[PDB]
Design an enzyme around this catalytic site. Structure first.
Site, PDB file in Angstrom:
ATOM      1  N   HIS A 130       0.824  -1.203   0.000  1.00  0.00           N
ATOM      2  CA  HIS A 130       0.000   0.000   0.000  1.00  0.00           C
ATOM      3  C   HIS A 130       0.858   1.253   0.000  1.00  0.00           C
ATOM      4  O   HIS A 130       1.933   1.284   0.604  1.00  0.00           O
ATOM      5  CB  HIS A 130      -0.914   0.049   1.231  1.00  0.00           C
ATOM      6  CG  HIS A 130      -1.691  -1.211   1.447  1.00  0.00           C
ATOM      7  ND1 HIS A 130      -1.584  -1.964   2.594  1.00  0.00           N
ATOM      8  CD2 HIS A 130      -2.601  -1.840   0.663  1.00  0.00           C
ATOM      9  CE1 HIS A 130      -2.390  -3.007   2.505  1.00  0.00           C
ATOM     10  NE2 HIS A 130      -3.015  -2.959   1.342  1.00  0.00           N
TER      11      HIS A 130
ATOM     12  N   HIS B 120       0.981   4.669   1.678  1.00  0.00           N
ATOM     13  CA  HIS B 120       0.446   5.397   2.809  1.00  0.00           C
ATOM     14  C   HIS B 120       0.676   6.889   2.616  1.00  0.00           C
ATOM     15  O   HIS B 120       1.509   7.315   1.813  1.00  0.00           O
ATOM     16  CB  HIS B 120       1.089   4.925   4.106  1.00  0.00           C
ATOM     17  CG  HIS B 120       0.690   3.538   4.496  1.00  0.00           C
ATOM     18  ND1 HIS B 120       0.073   3.254   5.697  1.00  0.00           N
ATOM     19  CD2 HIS B 120       0.821   2.355   3.848  1.00  0.00           C
ATOM     20  CE1 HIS B 120      -0.146   1.951   5.779  1.00  0.00           C
ATOM     21  NE2 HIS B 120       0.300   1.382   4.672  1.00  0.00           N
TER      22      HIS B 120
ATOM     23  N   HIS C 190      -3.573   4.643   4.764  1.00  0.00           N
ATOM     24  CA  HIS C 190      -3.436   4.551   3.316  1.00  0.00           C
ATOM     25  C   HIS C 190      -3.713   5.905   2.680  1.00  0.00           C
ATOM     26  O   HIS C 190      -4.556   6.671   3.154  1.00  0.00           O
ATOM     27  CB  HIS C 190      -4.380   3.475   2.737  1.00  0.00           C
ATOM     28  CG  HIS C 190      -4.080   2.094   3.229  1.00  0.00           C
ATOM     29  ND1 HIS C 190      -4.865   1.011   2.927  1.00  0.00           N
ATOM     30  CD2 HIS C 190      -3.069   1.619   4.006  1.00  0.00           C
ATOM     31  CE1 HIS C 190      -4.367  -0.076   3.494  1.00  0.00           C
ATOM     32  NE2 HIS C 190      -3.275   0.265   4.155  1.00  0.00           N
TER      33      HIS C 190
ATOM     34  N   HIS D 241     -11.453   1.254   1.978  1.00  0.00           N
ATOM     35  CA  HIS D 241     -10.381   0.419   1.452  1.00  0.00           C
ATOM     36  C   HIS D 241     -10.944  -0.626   0.490  1.00  0.00           C
ATOM     37  O   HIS D 241     -12.031  -1.167   0.698  1.00  0.00           O
ATOM     38  CB  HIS D 241      -9.652  -0.254   2.619  1.00  0.00           C
ATOM     39  CG  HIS D 241      -8.620  -1.252   2.197  1.00  0.00           C
ATOM     40  ND1 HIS D 241      -7.336  -0.899   1.848  1.00  0.00           N
ATOM     41  CD2 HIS D 241      -8.682  -2.601   2.080  1.00  0.00           C
ATOM     42  CE1 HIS D 241      -6.653  -1.981   1.517  1.00  0.00           C
ATOM     43  NE2 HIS D 241      -7.448  -3.027   1.646  1.00  0.00           N
TER      44      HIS D 241
ATOM     45  N   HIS E 104      -8.930   3.154  -1.797  1.00  0.00           N
ATOM     46  CA  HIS E 104      -7.993   4.248  -1.597  1.00  0.00           C
ATOM     47  C   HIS E 104      -7.076   4.354  -2.802  1.00  0.00           C
ATOM     48  O   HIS E 104      -6.806   3.367  -3.489  1.00  0.00           O
ATOM     49  CB  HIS E 104      -7.152   4.006  -0.335  1.00  0.00           C
ATOM     50  CG  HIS E 104      -7.964   3.778   0.896  1.00  0.00           C
ATOM     51  ND1 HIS E 104      -7.563   2.928   1.902  1.00  0.00           N
ATOM     52  CD2 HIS E 104      -9.140   4.315   1.302  1.00  0.00           C
ATOM     53  CE1 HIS E 104      -8.457   2.949   2.874  1.00  0.00           C
ATOM     54  NE2 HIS E 104      -9.420   3.788   2.536  1.00  0.00           N
TER      55      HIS E 104
ATOM     56  N   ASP F 235      -4.252   1.839  -2.623  1.00  0.00           N
ATOM     57  CA  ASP F 235      -4.565   0.410  -2.494  1.00  0.00           C
ATOM     58  C   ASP F 235      -4.019  -0.355  -3.689  1.00  0.00           C
ATOM     59  O   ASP F 235      -4.691  -0.510  -4.710  1.00  0.00           O
ATOM     60  CB  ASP F 235      -6.076   0.196  -2.386  1.00  0.00           C
ATOM     61  CG  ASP F 235      -6.648   0.658  -1.053  1.00  0.00           C
ATOM     62  OD1 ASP F 235      -5.850   0.805  -0.100  1.00  0.00           O
ATOM     63  OD2 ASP F 235      -7.893   0.873  -0.950  1.00  0.00           O
TER      64      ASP F 235
ATOM     65  N   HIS G 139       3.216  -5.172   4.117  1.00  0.00           N
ATOM     66  CA  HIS G 139       2.571  -5.520   5.379  1.00  0.00           C
ATOM     67  C   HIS G 139       2.766  -6.984   5.746  1.00  0.00           C
ATOM     68  O   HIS G 139       3.170  -7.821   4.942  1.00  0.00           O
ATOM     69  CB  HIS G 139       1.075  -5.205   5.330  1.00  0.00           C
ATOM     70  CG  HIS G 139       0.772  -3.742   5.407  1.00  0.00           C
ATOM     71  ND1 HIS G 139       0.441  -3.113   6.588  1.00  0.00           N
ATOM     72  CD2 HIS G 139       0.728  -2.789   4.443  1.00  0.00           C
ATOM     73  CE1 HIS G 139       0.221  -1.829   6.349  1.00  0.00           C
ATOM     74  NE2 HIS G 139       0.388  -1.610   5.057  1.00  0.00           N
TER      75      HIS G 139
ATOM     76  N   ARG H 219       3.456  -3.284   9.760  1.00  0.00           N
ATOM     77  CA  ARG H 219       4.271  -2.760   8.666  1.00  0.00           C
ATOM     78  C   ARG H 219       5.665  -3.372   8.756  1.00  0.00           C
ATOM     79  O   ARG H 219       6.420  -3.087   9.694  1.00  0.00           O
ATOM     80  CB  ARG H 219       4.297  -1.234   8.734  1.00  0.00           C
ATOM     81  CG  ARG H 219       2.912  -0.669   9.078  1.00  0.00           C
ATOM     82  CD  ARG H 219       2.820   0.848   9.093  1.00  0.00           C
ATOM     83  NE  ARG H 219       1.431   1.247   9.270  1.00  0.00           N
ATOM     84  CZ  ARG H 219       0.945   2.457   9.043  1.00  0.00           C
ATOM     85  NH1 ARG H 219       1.720   3.455   8.638  1.00  0.00           N
ATOM     86  NH2 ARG H 219      -0.353   2.673   9.217  1.00  0.00           N
TER      87      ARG H 219
HETATM   88 ZN   LIG Z   1      -6.509   1.099   1.665  1.00  0.00          ZN
END
Ligand SMILES: [Zn+2]
Ligand SMILES: [Zn+2]
Lengths: 154, 154
Positions: free
Chosen positions: B47, B49, B64, B72, B81, B84, B121, B144
């Protein structure tokens, strides 16, 4: 656009720091402040380099950010790289409490430094007044002690 | 303006890698490719962020990247997002050979991810289909493992 940025400086040695950038008005100056530790006492070149590329450490950041294709200078010179932020001074404890205000870098637009690399250098920047070819490119600030990509901050 | 970017993923554990971005046309998709090592075998959420802020590790990159304030989703969903990018898959040697193409992220404009943080992640991203509140925020992708600020590349 963006009004706040931040950069975490790391390297192969003990130099590390956090540098903040703030630009309340997109057409106004950028405040640059924070603390770098692990430095030898004295002046250290402090420059935005062109690429936010750390794949081979600070080397892959490339040369000074120079969209106008000018010669290296001090921040107060008209003839300067956009990334030419001059020097920071580390005290006797190895700490440089950075406090710079610059009106050539920006956090938006064509002079935008978001996503480029801030580098703190081994030696003083001679601000282009060193009489050699290296002076007009790097200020003779020497090797790259620490660097980080400049990122958008909250 | 920027047509290439790069990100060096580092963390507290063994996960590390290099991700490249390339966008030939500003109205066109971004190709995302590279290699991440040190992963457990299987799916890992992947992702962008919001903040390029690593001052407290990957945690300070924030949530995100979500300028449209949507829930999401997976990359193929209309409700997602901007950040994403779904999952990447690590093979039995712990390597994710990433190869993604996405037309919602950009290297310029409103959806520009330069100066933001790429995070890989701990767990699989459920693509927003998990039926709990966390699914609609993070896809239940867990902690993370490694991150880097996305920087302009040569
Ligand atoms: Zn997301
Ligand atoms: Zn310069």
């Amino acid at each position: 656009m963006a009004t706040k940025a931040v950069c975490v400086l790391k390297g192969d040695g003990p130099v590390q720091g956090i540098i903040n950038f703030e630009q309340k008005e997109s057409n106004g100056p950028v405040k640059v402040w924070g603390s770098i530790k692990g430095l030898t006492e004295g002046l250290h070149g402090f420059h935005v380099h062109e690429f936010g590329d750390n794949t081979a450490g600070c080397t892959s950041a490339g040369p000074h950010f120079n969209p106008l294709s000018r010669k290296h200078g001090g921040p107060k010179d008209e003839e300067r790289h956009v990334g030419d932020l001059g020097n920071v001074t580390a005290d006797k404890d190895g700490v440089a409490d950075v406090s710079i205000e610059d009106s050539v870098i920006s956090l938006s637009g064509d002079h935008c430094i978001i996503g480029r690399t801030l580098v703190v250098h081994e030696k003083a920047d001679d601000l282009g007044k060193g009489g050699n070819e290296e002076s007009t490119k790097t200020g003779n600030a020497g090797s790259r002690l620490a660097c980080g990509v400049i990122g958008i901050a909250q």
